[PDB]
Ligand binder design. Structure first.
Ligand SMILES: Nc1ncnc2c1ncn2[C@@H]1O[C@H](C[C@@H](N)CC[C@H](N)C(=O)O)[C@@H](O)[C@H]1O
Length: 390
């Protein structure tokens, strides 16, 4: 009924974090500030709403109908193919859309000398290549990349060895691109810096109750690789999830010592029903000291989830991060999860009718996106060289 015909486009969610003027102190364990119980309450609540789907997953019939309902409520379903044909875009995965929305919204000072980590399909790379040649008009776009060795579904790794920094097992002798290994992280940055200035670092790494806890070491390494290679004034983009763990918040505290601007973003192209978030750092203020490099790389070498800094020294920032969690996860994500279950209860046996109801809105939402993130045809001379088809 009416609850389907009033659904409006979501908005790009962007929450500014304060930079910390105090000197960074990498910790060598401490008592948490009280605001961490607020974060723990948010993790319990979000997992409660996420748990509302467990009954349907037990029988393969209802599990199927659920993933169709979720498919049906994906308001951006047909957009990737529309963007690909109309504007000659390449590797138009959902990450392409997310990267393109980020570039059009965050107003970076430079997107020209890019290091994309945990990538493989050039969704982020292709989007930056597309954005640079059609919007920024850099004379040439030079980029390096890495990823855990396959997969390369579009032949971007195979057709551009010069640009990829990981190694196939034929060279086991050797950086396989695994950023959970401290030796690899330092090597990746070193090779990357051997691209002379690096202006844009991006990492889309990712592996439900413990999704953030299971990705902590991955997201730690993907951030360390950027912070070891991003030049001053450069920009950083990192894929994350719930950001409720104390280690995660301490990592954000580190970011906030090295960047002029720091934002927790949630693009509309990112599914409103998932916890995926993007930490955007702008205008790198300074580089690591040799000590900061050693402590942090050692924390990865022998990893445990003890906070990296004294969280009690970052109350302002932690309140802003909670406001992000509240806005992105506790409000938006929970509302859409609830919305998906309402659709399931009323349309599990009427998938076609729900798709009919929402087809007009899907065009409105996608037309809005294309109006907000303006696209232009990418000339063939600037297409990335690809080795495979789909
Ligand atoms: N430990 C790891 N080290 C490096 N890359 C990893 C690791 N774990 C997963 N990955 C890669 O991270 C990527 C995960 C995706 N979110 C990346 C998507 C990519 N940005 C795209 O355009 O489609 C995949 O390419 C994985 O192989």
């Amino acid at each position: 009924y009416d609850w389907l015909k009033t659904v409006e486009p979501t908005n790009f969610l962007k929450i500014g974090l304060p930079y910390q003027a105090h000197p960074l102190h990498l910790q060598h364990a401490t008592t948490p500030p009280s605001i961490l119980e607020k974060f723990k309450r948010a993790d319990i609540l979000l997992n409660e709403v996420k748990a509302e789907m467990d009954p349907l997953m037990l029988q393969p019939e209802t599990e199927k109908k659920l993933f169709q309902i979720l498919s049906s409520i994906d308001m951006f379903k047909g957009l990737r193919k529309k963007v690909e044909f109309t504007y000659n875009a390449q590797i138009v995965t959902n990450a392409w859309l997310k990267m393109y929305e980020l570039l059009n919204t965050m107003n970076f000072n430079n997107t020209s000398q890019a290091f994309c980590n945990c990538e493989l399909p050039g969704g982020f790379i292709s989007a930056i290549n597309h954005f640079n040649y059609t919007m920024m008009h850099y004379p040439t776009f030079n980029w390096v990349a890495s990823s855990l060795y396959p997969e390369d579904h579009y032949g971007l790794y195979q057709c551009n060895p010069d640009n990829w920094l990981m190694q196939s097992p034929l060279l086991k002798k050797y950086n396989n691109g695994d950023v959970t290994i401290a030796s690899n992280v330092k090597n990746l940055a070193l090779r990357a810096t051997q691209l002379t200035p690096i202006h844009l670092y991006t990492a889309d790494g990712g592996i439900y109750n413990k999704q953030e806890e299971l990705n902590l070491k991955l997201h730690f390494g993907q951030a360390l690789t950027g912070l070891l290679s991003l030049s001053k004034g450069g920009n950083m983009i990192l894929k994350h999830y719930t950001l409720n763990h104390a280690f995660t918040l301490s990592l954000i505290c580190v970011f906030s010592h090295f960047f002029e601007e720091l934002y927790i973003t949630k693009p509309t192209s990112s599914r409103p029903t998932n916890s995926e978030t993007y930490i955007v750092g702008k205008n790198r203020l300074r580089l690591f000291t040799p000590k900061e490099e050693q402590v942090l790389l050692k924390r990865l070498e022998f990893f445990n989830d003890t906070p990296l800094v004294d969280l009690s020294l970052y109350q302002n920032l932690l309140e802003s991060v909670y406001f992000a969690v509240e806005t992105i996860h506790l409000k938006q994500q929970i509302e859409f999860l609830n919305f998906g279950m309402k659709c399931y209860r009323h349309f599990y046996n009427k998938i076609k009718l729900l798709n009919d109801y929402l087809a007009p809105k899907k065009k409105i939402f996608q037309d809005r996106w294309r109006v907000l993130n303006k696209l232009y045809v990418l000339e063939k001379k600037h297409k990335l060289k690809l080795c495979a088809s789909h």
